[PDB]
Every structure is written in C-alpha cells, then in structure tokens.
Design a protein around this ligand. Sequence first.
Ligand SMILES: CCCCCCCC/C=C/CCCCCCCC(=O)OC[C@H](COP(=O)(O)OCCN)OC(=O)CCCCCCC/C=C/CCCCCCCC
Ligand code: HEC
Ligand code: HEM
Ligand code: HEM
Ligand SMILES: C/C=C(C)/C=C/C=C/[C@H](OC)[C@@H](C)[C@@H](OC)[C@@H](C)CCc1oc2c(O)c(OC)cc(OC)c2c(=O)c1C
Ligand SMILES: CCCCCCO[C@@H]1O[C@H](CO)[C@@H](O)[C@H](O)[C@H]1O
Ligand SMILES: CCCCCCO[C@@H]1O[C@H](CO)[C@@H](O)[C@H](O)[C@H]1O
Ligand SMILES: CCCCCCO[C@@H]1O[C@H](CO)[C@@H](O)[C@H](O)[C@H]1O
Lengths: 66, 48, 99, 241, 48, 49, 29, 73, 365
Amino acid sequence: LVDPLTTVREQCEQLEKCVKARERLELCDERVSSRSQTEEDCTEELLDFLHARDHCVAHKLFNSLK
Amino acid sequence: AAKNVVSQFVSSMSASADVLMSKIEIKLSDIPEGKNMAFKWRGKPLFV
Amino acid sequence: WLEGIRKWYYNAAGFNKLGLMRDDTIHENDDVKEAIRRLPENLYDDRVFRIKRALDLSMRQQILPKEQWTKYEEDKSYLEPYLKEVIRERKEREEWAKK
Amino acid sequence: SDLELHPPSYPWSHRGLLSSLDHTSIRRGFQVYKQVCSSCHSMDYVAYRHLVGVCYTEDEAKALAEEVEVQDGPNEDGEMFMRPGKLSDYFPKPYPNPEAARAANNGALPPDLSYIVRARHGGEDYVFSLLTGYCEPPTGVSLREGLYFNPYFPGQAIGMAPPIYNEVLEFDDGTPATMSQVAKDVCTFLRWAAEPEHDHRKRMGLKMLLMMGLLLPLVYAMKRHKWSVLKSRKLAYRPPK
Amino acid sequence: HLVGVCYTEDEAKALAEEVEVQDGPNEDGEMFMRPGKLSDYFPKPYPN
Amino acid sequence: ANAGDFGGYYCPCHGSHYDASGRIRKGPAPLNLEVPSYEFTSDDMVIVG
Amino acid sequence: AFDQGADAIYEHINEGKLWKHIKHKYENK
Amino acid sequence: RQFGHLTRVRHVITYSLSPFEQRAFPHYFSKGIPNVLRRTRACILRVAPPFVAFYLVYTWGTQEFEKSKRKNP
Amino acid sequence: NNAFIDLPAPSNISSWWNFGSLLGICLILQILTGLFLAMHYTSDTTTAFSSVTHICRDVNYGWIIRYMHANGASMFFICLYMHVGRGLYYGSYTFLETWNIGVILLLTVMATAFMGYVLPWGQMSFWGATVITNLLSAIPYIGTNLVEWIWGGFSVDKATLTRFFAFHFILPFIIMAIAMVHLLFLHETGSNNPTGISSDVDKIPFHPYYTIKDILGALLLILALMLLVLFAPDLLGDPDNYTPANPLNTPPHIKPEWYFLFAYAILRSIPNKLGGVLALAFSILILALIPLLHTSKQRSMMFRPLSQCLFWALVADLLTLTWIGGQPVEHPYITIGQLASVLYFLLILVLMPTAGTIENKLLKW
Ligand SMILES: CCCCCCCC/C=C/CCCCCCCC(=O)OC[C@H](COP(=O)(O)OCCN)OC(=O)CCCCCCC/C=C/CCCCCCCC
Ligand code: HEC
Ligand code: HEM
Ligand code: HEM
Ligand SMILES: C/C=C(C)/C=C/C=C/[C@H](OC)[C@@H](C)[C@@H](OC)[C@@H](C)CCc1oc2c(O)c(OC)cc(OC)c2c(=O)c1C
Ligand SMILES: CCCCCCO[C@@H]1O[C@H](CO)[C@@H](O)[C@H](O)[C@H]1O
Ligand SMILES: CCCCCCO[C@@H]1O[C@H](CO)[C@@H](O)[C@H](O)[C@H]1O
Ligand SMILES: CCCCCCO[C@@H]1O[C@H](CO)[C@@H](O)[C@H](O)[C@H]1O
C-alpha cells in the first residue's frame, strides 16, 4: 500500500525552492553535527524546507484521496 | 438605617462564608530538577 | 508669500466651491447668533440663500461650475463689524459682573 | 523553539462558500475516531444520536452505541450498573478525569476533540498537517523522553506519538487506508464535530444572498424614487432690487 | 457552620476530622479518603 | 515558566518578564511574584500556608 | 418555489456529498 | 423644533417634480462616475497618505520581526 | 409625529448619519438574541461552557442565535467607532450633552460586551475577567479590595460568573434607557450635517427621506451580519475561547477581542502598572475633552484640510494600534506601539487644536 503523500512529497521535493531549502538544511546538519558543544539546531532550516514542500503538496495531494 | 441597609447589600457581594484558607502539603520528590510545578491553592496557581 | 499659501488654503478648504463666503461657515455660538440677528435684511437674506444653495449642493454631492466659485480676492467679512461689537458688549458686561 | 510553521491550505471539498461537508468522508472520519483517537481523546459534546442523518442511519447508530457499555443507575438497591449504550449517550470518555489522562500519557493531556478544529488556528489544515507531519528531529534537537518532534506543533515537541499510519484501520467502504487518507477523513469528521451546523448555515447563506440580491436593488430603487423629488429640485433667489 | 454557634473553631476542626471524606483525583487520577475539614459538609449516610 | 528573557517566567498578557527567582525584570508588573509562608518538613515535603 | 429552487441549487452544487445523496447505500427498509 | 418655527427665509423659490414624472437614475453612469472620480481626487491627498504610512510601517515591521527570529537576518 | 414622522432633518446628511439608527438596531438585535440565549444559558462554572455548546448543538437554531449574538457584538462596535468618528470629523461633539451621554454609552457598551464575553467561560473569558477587573487594583489603597469585592472572592470564580450574567443581562436595558436620553438631547437641536453649517433654512421631513435611507442602511447591516454568521461565523472570534477556562494556565498568545485591541496596545505600551491603566482610561475619557480642545472657528472638518489630514492620521494610528495589539510584545512591535500610543494623544491633545488655530489664521480670523 503506497500513501500518495509519499509520492507527492517526492515530486514536490524536486522543485527548486525545496532543493534549495534541502541544501541549506544538509549544510546545517553538517555544521551542527560536526560540533560537540553548540546551542544551534536545524529547526529553522527544516521549517523552511517543509514550508516550501508542503505548500506544493497541498496543491496536489487531495487529487489522490477519496 | 440607610448606612446599615446599604452596607448589608454591599456586604452580600463580598466573599461568602464558603469562600473564606487551608495549608497545602507538597511532595518535593515528584518534582524533577528544572521543572516548574503548578498547583491550585487558595484559588490561585502555586508554583513549586 | 503668506498670501500665496492663503489663497492655496482658501481653495483647498473649498467652501468657495459651494459658493459660500468664509463668514457663511462660522460656527454659530451665541455671539454669532446675535451678530447674525443684527445683520441688515439684504445681507441676512443673502447669507440664507448661499447656505441654502450650499446645503443643496452638498446633498447632491456636487459643486458649482468653477466660474461661480467664491473668489479668494472677493471674499470679505460682512459679519465682522457686527460680531466684533457683540463681543465687545459682552466683555463689558462681564467686567461689570466681576465688580 | 519559538519559530512557527503555519499549515498550508488544503483544498477541502467543504472549503467553498457554498460547499457542504462530504458525508461519506465524515462517516470514515468517525471510524478513525472510534478505532484510533477514542482510546486517548474524549469527545464530550457528541452523542450517537448526532450521527443519525449525518453519516449513519438510525439503526446503524443504534448498533454503534450498543458496541459499548456505559454506567447507569442507581438501580433499586442504589447501585450503579453497566448497560449497552444508546442513542442518547455521549461518546465514552477514555479516562475518568484529566489527571488519569495525564498519568496514562506521560504527563501530557489529550484534549477533548469536540471542538479541536475550532479551537486551533488553522482548523483542519492544522490538524491534517500535524497528523501527517511527524518527522525525525532536526540535527541539534533532543527531546525529553515522551516527546515527539512535530514541526507543526507549537514548540515542535508534542506528547502524542504519531497516531496514524498506513492500515491503522480498515474502512467500511474498502477505501485504501493510507495515512493521508485517514488524516483527511478524520479531519473532515472533526470539522463536522466542531460545527454540525456547517451545511445548514451555507444553505441559508445561499438563500440570504438570493434574497438580498433582490431586496437591496428594490429598496435602493425606492430610496432613489422618493429622493428624486429633492435631487432635481431647482432653487431661485429673487430679492427685490 | 458550627463555629461560633456551639463549638469553637478548634472543636469544630476536631469534629470534622472524625470523619473520612472522599477527595481527589490525585496525581494518578484516583479518588482518595482524607480526614474531614471545616469546609466539608456533613457526610451523607447513603450515596443516593 | 521557562519563557521570557531571563529563563524564569513570561506573562503573556502584557509582557512582564520574571527571572527564576520570581522577580520582575521587565514589563509593567510592579512587584516580584509573591513568596508564601512555607516550611520544609520530613522526607521531601514542603508545607505552604 | 424560492426554497425548493435554492435547495436544488445547493444540492446540485454539493452533488453526492450530502446524506440524502448517499443515504440509499445504508438504508433498505 | 418643528416646521413653521425653524427660521426666517425670504425671496427663495423652489421648483420640484413629482417622482412619477422623473427617472430615478438620471445619468447614473454618464454623470455619476465622473462625479465619483472628482470626489475621489478631491480627498485622496487627505485620506490616503496616512494609510500608506500605515501600510509602510506594517510591512517594514512585520518583515523586521520575521528577520529578527532567524539565524542570519 | 413631531417625534419621528415630521421630525425636521437636514436635507444633506450623508451615510455617516446612518450609524445612529444602526446602533439602535444593533442594540435591539443583541437584546433579542441575548434574551433567547439567556433562556438556555446557566451561569454555574460547572455548566456554563456546556450550556453554550448545548445551545449551539441541540437547541433548534441555537447556533444561529448564538453566532448572531457574537457577531452582533462586533457589528455593534464597528458602528460605534464609525458613529464616534463621524462625530469627531463633523464637530457633532459641540452638542455637549448628547456627546457626553454618548461617551457614557461607549463605556457602558464596552463593559457590557466584556461581561458577555466572560459568560461562555472559555480561556479568554476567564483571563479577560481576570485582567479587566484587575484594572481596578491600580487604584491606590482600595484597589485590591475593590477587585475582590467585584469578584466575590480572592479570584475569579463561581461568584464572579453568576454576577456577570446578571450584570450582562441588565446593562443592555440600562444602555437602552440612556440611549433614549441621548436622543432626547439631540432632538432639542436637531442633527448636525456635513458642512457643519446650520441647516434650519433647508430641513426636510424625517419621513420618507431618512426612514427609507435607514431601512436601506439596516438591510446592509443585516447583510454584513448574516454574511459573517452564515459564511464566516468565527472570523472575528478567538479560537482560544473554544477551550474551557483553566485557572492554572493563561494561553501564550492570548489577546483581546478585536474591538479592544487599540486600547490594549496603549496599556501594553507603558512599562508601569498605574501608568498603563491611566492611559487606557484616558484613551477613552479623552473623548469628553474633545469639545474643550476645539479651536477652529468652523464646526466641521469638511472645510479644514489640515484637520482632515490629522484626522486621518488618527484613524490610521488606531489601525496601527489595533494591529500592534494583535502582535507579540517583541521588537519592533514594542516600539511601534509606544510611538503609535504617543501619536494618539499627541494628535488629539496638541496637533489637532494647533491645526485648528493655524487654519483660523490662514482665514484671517
Ligand atoms: C432606592 C434607594 C436606596 C437607598 C437605601 C434605602 C434605605 C431606606 C432607609 C430606611 C428607612 C426605614 C427605617 C428602618 C429602620 C431599621 C433599623 C436598622 O437600621 O437596624 C440595623 C440593622 C442591622 O443591625 P445589626 O446587624 O445587629 O448591627 C449593626 C451594626 N453594624 O439593619 C436592619 O434592621 C435592616 C433594615 C432594612 C430596611 C428596609 C429597606 C427599605 C428600602 C427601601 C428603598 C426605597 C425607598 C423608600 C423611601 C424611604 C422612606 C423612609
Ligand atoms: C494516545 C496514545 C493518543 C492517541 C491514540 C491519539 N492522541 Fe492526540 N494527543 C495525545 C496527547 C497526549 C496529546 C497532547 C500533546 C501535547 O503535548 O500537548 C494529543 C494531542 C492532540 C491534538 C492537539 C494538539 C494541540 O495543538 O494541542 C490533536 C488535534 C490530536 N491529538 C488529534 C488526535 C487525533 C485526531 C487522533 C486519532 C487519529 C489522536 N489524536 C490520537 C494522545 C493521543
Ligand atoms: C448605544 C450607542 C448609541 C446609540 C444607540 C446612539 C444613537 C444615536 C442616534 C440614533 C443618533 C441620531 C442619528 C445619527 O446622527 O446617527 C445619534 C446622534 C449622535 N450621537 Fe449617538 N448613539 C450611541 C452612542 C454614541 C457615542 C458613543 C457618541 C460619541 C462619543 C455619540 C454621539 C452622538 C452625537 C454627537 C450625535 C449627533 C451627531 C450629528 O448630528 O452629527 N453617540 N446617536
Ligand atoms: C449591548 C447588548 C449586548 C452586547 C454588546 C452583548 C455582547 C455579548 C458578547 C460579546 C458575548 C459573548 C459571545 C460569545 O463569544 O460567545 C455575549 C454573551 C451572552 N450574552 Fe450578550 N450582549 C448584549 C446583550 C445581551 C442581553 C440583553 C442578554 C440577555 C438578556 C445577553 C445574554 C447573553 C448570554 C446568555 C450570553 C452567553 C452565551 C454566549 O456566549 O453566546 N446579552 N454577549
Ligand atoms: C463588574 C464590571 C466591570 C469590572 C467592568 C469593567 C470594564 C472596564 C472597561 O470598560 C469600560 C474595559 C472593558 C475597557 O477599558 C476601557 C476595555 C477597552 C479593556 C480592554 C482590555 O481587554 C482585554 C481583554 O478583553 C482580554 O481578553 C482575553 C485580555 C486582556 O489582557 C490580557 C485585555 C486588556 O489588557 C485590556 C486593556
Ligand atoms: C500639504 C502641502 C502644502 C504645500 C503648500 C501649498 O502651496 C501652494 O501650492 C500650489 C500648487 O502646488 C501653488 O500653485 C501655490 O502657488 C503654492 O502657494
Ligand atoms: C444668545 C445671547 C443673546 C445676547 C444678546 C445681547 O444683546 C445686546 O446686549 C448689549 C449689552 O452690552 C446691549 O447694549 C444691546 O443693545 C443688546 O442688543
Ligand atoms: C473583516 C476583516 C477580517 C480580517 C481577517 C482576520 O481577522 C482576525 O483573525 C484572527 C484569527 O484568524 C482572530 O483571532 C482575530 O480576532 C480576527 O480579527
């Protein structure tokens, strides 16, 4: 059983806005994880990414749902 | 007469007998370091 | 030129577009009501008509053709001499009241 | 954290001005509440009779009520007793009180859902995003035990573990129970639960618009009719020279 | 209510304490018994 | 609790910030949060009142 | 006529979504 | 205050037509729009500036608030 | 007749003069819907919130009556602010008695709406009740005593809710009587008009001219109200009040009803308790000072361009305050709010009177 949400999310993550957001996120991960002591986390980068992606998902997903 | 009647009516709006101060016992072991615990006490939040 | 700005203000104020004269727009307090009562018949009847015409235009949300707008250079105070005297008389009475 | 992530806008079939709720969707959403949400969340203001004529027939709703046991009484001996539920009964509460609820949920309190959709900015867009939005914590984030990272929840740390997933339940109509499908139906049901007057108000809205569409131009014509006498009046000043 | 009418406050406290009244829920969501206190009403001989 | 600029408390109604001692640090509140009478007893118990 | 006409419009706009539209699937008295 | 005792008016003539003899929307659009345009122009310099200022403070403020919450404003 | 039908009315009053009759209609609609709600509402803190949900869920048409009452309160305030704005712009406040009774009407409607909002006993109800009654604590020496007296205890509780239902119930009727006096005083002078010039030379009968304009205005009010009730009943409300009162927790983004946001922004702008309460009270009572600050030789702002600009600055400033009140107490909102709050009093107390004098000089009087 495949949730269309998975499919739609993959297609949406292809958009430039999401790829760009994903890249800033991966950068953050690298930066943060490379430390032992830091108050920084990547919530901001993740939210930016989710915002771009979920805006796209919202435009398509319901076309796959009953 | 006026002074008594008026004050009796004004008095009726003040806290009634049932509203007027039991102490409260709290178990410190149940409160982990860094935690703010709230309890209702004497009709208000009590923070421990 | 204070006068430059005055003529600009006069037109911006715009009561002239309703054909009104400055004195036609004064807030009527008791001094003013007495001054109006003292106006000679023709000046009084003229004031009444300019106000009636202005209220009528206002009601229609219209203004007069520009050629009929009161002109800054022609607007003179027809009320001043009557109102000044009414105010001087009242000031006099107040002085006596204070005594 | 203090950052906020607002839910996007989903194209709910009841989103439009004159758009009613999808009642088959409400029906499935109820099944989700019944099989999943009800073990932790109460729905204090909804009773079985409320489902009649909305998503279940009277007989079906009666059978649903009978699936549970509710306390009743006292009986002749002054005893409380258990009996099968009936239409007049409200949905059973998973816990006797909020303290028990917190104790059974690592200190967190599952709110009552009767109004959740109206009690949260975002409404169903928020509930849907929350339900389908769990993910792993971003690098640098560590949540205390019992908390889960959900980017849509304020502060991003929620005490409810992901409650739905593929095949979390089987729908009565064969509809593939993917997580997103389950979220969409439960959200539709929650909207109905928070606003049962939803469809009726929009139907009245239609009639109101139609009536105003008639009455406004008519009254305006009456206004213009009466006022025409003043609008075209002409004045002349004829003082004796 | 007995205080200042037929018993002193301390006597009335002692009287209240002669009974066990249900209270709660506690942290675990359970009801519990405790000694009565001035604010408690006279215990009912029957639940209903 | 744990909000505001002093890690103490933050009152959302009008923005009063208190520190972890309940003392008013910023905003319109005029006084530190009230400290009641209390006594620590046996075990891990405190009696307030 | 107004009520019937309006309801018809409403029911048409919401074709297949209302209880009256799916009711047959669960009844059979 | 009643008609007959309002004030003194002399030498004014008023002419009116029954509403049944006239159109209720004479030149509604042909003269209406132009007048609405005149009236709009006559006030916009007085009404609009403050709201544009509000609009400016609002966008600046909102954006300034958003920038201040992130890592690299 | 000579009370209504043959009432002499200026021939040129505009749409801005419709708000008085709209306020009357708002009052009547609130009273009627309110009465029907009172027939099903119970004020015990254990049943208040539940009784409201019962009205909305099981009382026939209870939901429509409830949302009409709620949105009616919003329509009431929109009309109130328009009504006051009209009076300020046209110099209507020179009818001193009518204006001062008006100021009392404003405070009474605010108190009434506040109390009604407490009745459902949601989170905003509880904290609204807590904060607003506590404004009295800023009074030296007796403040705290007054608060506890109002509350009927040491905190907002059962006694508070029950008496607020009784106050909410009777105040609208008192408001109606006061509104009647508001009208009696107005009939002595008749209405002001857009030009601010006496209209005794051009009066027309109230009927049919304004009776028909009033009906039209009423239709548009009903339209606005029903569009909210039938298409967006919660648009102007706060989701937080759908959560029962919790005395141990104040929602983190709590905010006042939209029509109170500007005053709230003002109080919140001052980092001093007494200072904020004084400015909140003054933000409303300054209305009673407007007549005394009138320096212009002309009554209405129609012929005063400088005054108009300032008037609109004031409206935009109230919009700014309304917006700020809806935002968190964080930068840069704190500063915008303090500036907007200063501007408010500056415009009314200094700039407008000054503009009045400057216009007088430009006209040589
Ligand atoms: C609408 C106006 C509202 C203003 C208030 C109205 C008050 C009316 C004036 C009363 C005149 C009638 C005389 C009554 C004599 C009563 C004797 C009295 O006051 O005894 C005191 C006693 C309390 O004693 P203690 O608790 O033991 O201790 C006191 C020390 N703290 O109080 C009483 O007995 C209460 C008396 C109740 C009076 C009845 C109320 C009448 C109100 C009417 C309002 C309308 C107007 C009528 C016109 C007035 C004509 C005289
Ligand atoms: C117990 C195992 C749960 C099940 C099953 C479901 N939920 Fe839940 N939910 C639970 C808890 C303990 C909490 C509190 C979270 C916190 O940290 O405060 C929640 C919360 C919600 C919320 C509210 C979130 C908010 O904004 O406050 C919603 C809307 C919610 N839960 C929905 C929901 C639904 C529809 C469920 C079935 C699909 C569901 N929950 C199941 C615990 C549990
Ligand atoms: C319950 C609220 C109120 C009611 C029902 C009410 C009703 C009315 C009515 C019916 C009129 C005549 C019609 C009109 O000119 O609009 C009027 C006029 C007036 N009202 Fe109010 N009013 C209320 C509140 C207020 C407030 C709060 C103020 C100002 C602080 C006020 C000031 C005035 C003034 C000055 C006039 C005359 C305006 C003019 O002639 O230009 N009113 N009101
Ligand atoms: C000036 C007129 C009035 C105003 C401005 C007003 C306003 C309000 C407001 C803002 C609420 C909260 C509504 C909500 O969000 O739920 C409310 C509630 C209520 N009002 Fe009024 N009201 C008025 C008159 C009345 C009258 C006369 C009655 C009763 C005789 C009344 C009875 C109620 C009741 C029972 C509630 C609680 C139910 C509810 O919340 O809807 N009100 N009112
Ligand atoms: C027994 C009757 C009593 C005591 C009545 C007294 C009424 C007093 C005034 O009316 C005259 C008052 C309503 C009026 O002040 C001018 C308002 C504009 C006050 C506005 C106001 O609202 C708030 C509010 O609604 C809230 O809700 C969630 C929360 C609030 O902060 C957290 C506020 C608040 O901080 C202010 C200033
Ligand atoms: C609100 C801005 C006020 C500026 C003062 C206006 O000043 C006026 O402007 C007119 C048109 O530009 C000129 O024709 C006129 O000579 C000048 O005095
Ligand atoms: C509404 C207020 C009416 C004022 C009427 C003033 O009336 C004036 O008072 C003077 C006193 O100094 C008299 O000398 C003068 O003859 C008289 O017409
Ligand atoms: C008629 C103009 C309405 C402006 C739309 C937004 O309106 C706002 O929505 C918020 C939540 O969404 C509410 O908390 C707030 O009270 C309300 O004024």
